[PDB]
Amino acid sequence: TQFEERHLKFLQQLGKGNFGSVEMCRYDPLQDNTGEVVAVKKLQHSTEEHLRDFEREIEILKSLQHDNIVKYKGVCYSAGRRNLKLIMEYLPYGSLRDYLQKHKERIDHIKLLQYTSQICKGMEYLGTKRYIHRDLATRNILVENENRVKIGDFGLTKVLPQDKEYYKVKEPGESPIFWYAPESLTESKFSVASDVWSFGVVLYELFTYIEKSKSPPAEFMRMIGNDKQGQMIVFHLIELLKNNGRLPRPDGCPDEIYMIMTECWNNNVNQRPSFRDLALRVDQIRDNMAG
Numbered sequence: 450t451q452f453e454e455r456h457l458k459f460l461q462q463l464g465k466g467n468f469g470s471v472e473m474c475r476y477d478p479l480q481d482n483t484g485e486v487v488a489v490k491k492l493q494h495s496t497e498e499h500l501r502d503f504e505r506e507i508e509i510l511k512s513l514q515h516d517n518i519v520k521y522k523g524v525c526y527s528a529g530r531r532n533l534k535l536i537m538e539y540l541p542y543g544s545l546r547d548y549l550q551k552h553k554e555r556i557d558h559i560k561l562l563q564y565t566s567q568i569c570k571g572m573e574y575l576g577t578k579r580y581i582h583r584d585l586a587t588r589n590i591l592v593e594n595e596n597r598v599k600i601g602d603f604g605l606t607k608v609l610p611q612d613k614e615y616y617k618v619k620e621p622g623e624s625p626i627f628w629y630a631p632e633s634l635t636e637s638k639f640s641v642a643s644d645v646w647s648f649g650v651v652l653y654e655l656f657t658y659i660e661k662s663k664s665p666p667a668e669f670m671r672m673i674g675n676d677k678q679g680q681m682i683v684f685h686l687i688e689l690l691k692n693n694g695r696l697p698r699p700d701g702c703p704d705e706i707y708m709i710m711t712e713c714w715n716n717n718v719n720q721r722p723s724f725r726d727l728a729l730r731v732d733q734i735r736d737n738m739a740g
C-alpha cells in the first residue's frame with residue numbers, strides 16, 4: 450500500500466471535484482509496461498487545512514470494504530506529505546452520470562433500479578460506521594461494469610460525533626446546494642437523513658437520464674426564476690423548499706418511484722425513510738417489474 454511516485458505514469462485526467470483532482474495512471478515499477486492502471490487522487494492546491502482533511506478522507510476510505518464502495522489501494526507520499534496522493538482501483542466505465550448520458554438507449558428502468566439498490570447498500574454500510582457522505586450525486590458514483598456501481602468519492606464525508614445524530618459543517622466556497630436538504634442549507638446540519646434527501650436527488654437524476662435542461666440546478670433555477678444570482682439563490686431555494694416546491698416527476702418515471710423521491714424530500718428530517726427501507730422498497734418494485 451506504498452507507491453513510489455517515479456513509477457506512476459500519467460494517462461488522463463478523470464475529474465475535479467471539491468478540492469481534489471483524479472488522474473488515470475499506470476503504476477509500473479518494473480518499467481516494462483506490465484503494471485496495472487489505477488486512479489490517483491490529489492489536492493488541486495496543497496494547503497495545511499486541506500491536507501488534514503485529505504488525510505481523514507483517506508482513513509475513511511481505507512476503513513470501508515464493500516462491493517459498492519471503490520477500493521483503496523495505498524498512498525504515495527514520495528514527493529513529500531504536501532504531494533500526498535490517494536491510490537484507488539480504476540473503474541473503467543467512468544461516472545454513472547456520464548455513463549447514463551452515453552448509454553440512455555441501453556439502460557432500462559429495471560437497470561436504473563439495480564443501480565439505485567446498490568447505491569442504497571453502500572450508503573447503509575456507511576451509516577453503520579456513522580459516516581455522513583455529504584455529496585451524494587451521480588457524478589460521484591462510478592461504474593465498474595454494466596451490473597455494478599460504486600460510491601467513488603469521499604471528499605466531503607464526515608464522522609458523526611459520538612453523542613449526536615447530526616454534524617454541523619460549513620466549508621469555504623461552493624456547495625452543491627441543489628442536492629442539499631433544507632436543514633443543511635439553513636442550519637448546516639448534516640445527517641444520515643440529509644444523505645437520504647440527496648439520495649432522492651440521485652434517484653431523480655437517474656430517471657431524467659441526465660437530460661441537460663432537466664438537471665436539479667436547471668429545474669430549481671427555473672422554479673426560483675432565472676432573474677436571480679449570487680447570495681440570493683440559496684435564500685430563494687430555502688423558501689421554495691419550505692413551501693413544498695419540489696423537482697418534478699421525470700419524463701416516464703413511474704409514480705411508485707416518484708413517491709420514493711418525494712418521501713426522501715420530506716421537510717421533517719425524522720420522517721425520511723431509512724436506507725434499509727429504501728433498498729426494500731426498490732427491490733420490491735424491481736421484482737414486480739421482473740415477473
Ligand SMILES: CS(=O)(=O)c1ccc(-c2cccn3nc(Nc4ccc(N5CCOCC5)cc4)nc23)cc1
Pocket residue numbers: 462463464465466467469470471488519537538539540541542543544547588589591601602
Ligand atoms: C467526481 S470527480 O470528478 O472528482 C472524480 C473522478 C474520478 C474518481 C475516481 C475515483 C476512484 C476510481 N475511479 N475510477 C474512475 N474512472 C473513470 C474512468 C473514466 C472516466 N471518464 C470517461 C472518459 O471521459 C472522461 C472521464 C472517469 C472516471 N474514476 C475514479 C472520483 C472522483
